[PDB]
Amino acid sequence: RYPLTFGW
Amino acid sequence: MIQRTPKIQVYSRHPAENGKSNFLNCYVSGFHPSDIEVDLLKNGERIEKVEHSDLSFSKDWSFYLLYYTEFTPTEKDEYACRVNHVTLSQPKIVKWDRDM
Amino acid sequence: GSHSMRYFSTSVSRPGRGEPRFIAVGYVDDTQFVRFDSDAASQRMEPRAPWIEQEGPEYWDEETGKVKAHSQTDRENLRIALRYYNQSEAGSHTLQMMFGCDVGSDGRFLRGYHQYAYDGKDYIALKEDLRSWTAADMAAQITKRKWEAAHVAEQQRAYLEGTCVDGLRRYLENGKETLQRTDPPKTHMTHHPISDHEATLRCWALGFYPAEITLTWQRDGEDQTQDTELVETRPAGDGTFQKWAAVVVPSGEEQRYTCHVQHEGLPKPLTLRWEP
Amino acid sequence: DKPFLSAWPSAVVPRGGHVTLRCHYRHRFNNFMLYKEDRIHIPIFHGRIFQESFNMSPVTTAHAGNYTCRGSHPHSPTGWSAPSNPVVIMVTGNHRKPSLLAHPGPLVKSGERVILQCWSDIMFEHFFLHKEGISKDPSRLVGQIHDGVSKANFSIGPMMLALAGTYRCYGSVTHTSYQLSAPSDPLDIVVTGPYEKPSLSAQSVTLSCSSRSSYDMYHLSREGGAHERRLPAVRKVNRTFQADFPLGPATHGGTYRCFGSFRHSPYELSDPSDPLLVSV
Ligand SMILES: *[C@@H]1O[C@H](CO)[C@@H](O)[C@H](O)[C@H]1NC(C)=O
Ligand SMILES: *[C@@H]1O[C@H](CO)[C@@H](O)[C@H](O)[C@H]1NC(C)=O
Ligand SMILES: *[C@@H]1O[C@H](CO)[C@@H](O)[C@H](O)[C@H]1NC(C)=O
Ligand SMILES: *[C@@H]1O[C@H](CO)[C@@H](O)[C@H](O)[C@H]1NC(C)=O
């Protein structure tokens, strides 16, 4: 399942 | 900036037998950045209907791609793979050797 | 036994040559099963293995939502990196992410991953305990401070221990005949004279899955690593893999050397020995 | 006389998988032609002669069919053998999976019967029950239409170890039985007995499961409970084998039973212990 991703 | 020249392997999917339909593979790996130009050649000339895998990379972040096309090996015809990359001044050509 | 799920994403900027491009691929072990390409006309998460095509539209909506969100986030992250490193608007740059989990034979969580790289070098990585971040340089220290403030590690830990493991377990049952197969290596040797006093023994392994394999040469025992050439394991293109090992041996001494093959598909290690 | 045709690893194969047809004729995996029941006298691929094996991979829906082979008999009137036994390649993953349920449950006493009900909201014309790892053809039943669900009752028994294991069922619709749906979720059928039941008793509650039979493992199950507990059996000096299951102070109680099992025997258990009432 694709992950939640966050900004740098 | 980090630059890694590609490793190139040219080989067939199945063991080569003259007259038998097969797949010619060009596996490029270990390269960075991702922009790379790969062609499969028959007697120095680009083969048209070549396909390739989706861009992925290894744990060390180096990229790898598989290029392939259907072909029938002969004793006469000479197949190769041609690779260009920012690390290469001119395209590198690796001849298919059915013995590796 | 043990299994892994992996997502690999690559975002590249190419000013003057195209819009920034995002490509993500999903793997179970050595089998790719999904892809997303911000350049393609689909704008959907796409199936790449027949066994994932059984998943219903609610799955593809959810996966497409998360990967388009990542596509947008990591393209903006290229712009953030330009400021962090004080780099020109004109350069081409690469941003990579790896994410996934491992499970043991029992199906229970073993270890999770969530790591980034910028221009080929390690940027930030979730540590082993899934509680802290490894910042490689000074720019990544800012991202570390940001993700601590947003409690990112806590969210990713719950994701790596829950949905990642539960999704992998589900994938393994849905693609069982493909993903839990072991194709043992089909092996043989070739003999190629170099000179009249030397020859090359090449030990072949073909058509095996998964890709993990060990090829070793020994004469009369003990590793013969001296001039043991070993190509990188390579995909055949049909789901199986190839590898060979070669050593140069004095002419007439071929019977002393043996090639040993170890692979998950072989119950006992193979010992191969060349013969006229 | 006639060759032996066989599919490996399984004649039930998912679309995109791989299956290999071999034609063992006359003390070797021979040169052979292949015939599908659609054209009983025309060899496939214009009379293609296969060497050793025919590896179909990746499996497509076009591979599905009812195959026979004829082995090369060079010094023969016709030059080829009689037709082989038929092998039916069934390709799966073409519809969405049905459901598979055991009645009254998946633990079946040795020598008794169980009903494996395959069902779906999809109006499947037929259902197929297949035991994992088995070479025989899947059993076929007509889908009985009832309350907007299609369904069929497979009778399994009398239960022996040979009938225990992992089952999956499939649906088909106007497929000549060669195109199958995706497989139902696997169901494990377990035979109980004839190995003697353990003893279950209370030893802040801890339940001791005990026997003199040298079980390697004990399984503790609560009536209507979600999951079992399992624990290695410990050898005692009085020749009993025993494991102690701590239930903890959470309690809630219920009725418990325990089973013995052996290593390398995944689908059989001892007779269940007598039910044990645990007070709250
Ligand atoms: C058939 O071919 C596939 C793909 O090349 C391979 O995975 C499989 O092992 C082959 N079957 C046999 C019996 O070698
Ligand atoms: C396959 O064909 C044979 C005759 O060649 C027939 O006896 C058999 O019933 C067929 N199998 C199925 C599943 O239809
Ligand atoms: C199948 O068997 C179960 C249990 O015996 C029963 O409840 C159900 O009605 C049966 N379905 C039929 C006969 O179609
Ligand atoms: C054997 O010993 C165990 C404790 O080690 C005890 O609980 C059990 O009752 C004994 N069995 C018999 C038959 O006396």
Automatic annotation (TrEMBL), chain C:
It is found in: Cell membrane; Membrane. Belongs to the MHC class I family. The gene is HLA-A. Disulfide bonds join C101-C164, C203-C259. Keywords: Disulfide bond, Glycoprotein, Immunity, Membrane, MHC I, Phosphoprotein, Signal, Transmembrane, Transmembrane helix. The keyword Disulfide bond applies. The keyword Aminoacyl-tRNA synthetase does not apply. Residues 185-271 form the Ig-like domain. The chain holds residues 25 to 300 of 342 of the full protein. One of its GO terms (cellular component) is lumenal side of endoplasmic reticulum membrane. It comes from Homo sapiens. It comes from the Eukaryota. This is MHC class I antigen. It is a single-pass membrane protein; Single-pass type I membrane protein. GO terms for biological process: antigen processing and presentation of peptide antigen via MHC class I.
From TrEMBL, chain D:
SUPFAM superfamilies: Immunoglobulin. CDD domains: IgC2_D2_LILR_KIR_like. SMART domains: IG. It is a single-pass type I membrane protein. InterPro entries: Ig-like_dom_sf (IPR036179), Ig-like_fold (IPR013783), Ig-like_Receptors_ImmuneReg (IPR050412), Ig_sub (IPR003599), Immunoglobulin_dom (IPR013151). Its main location: membrane. Residues 8-92, 103-183, 203-280 form the Immunoglobulin domain. Transmembrane segments: none annotated. This is KIR3DL1.
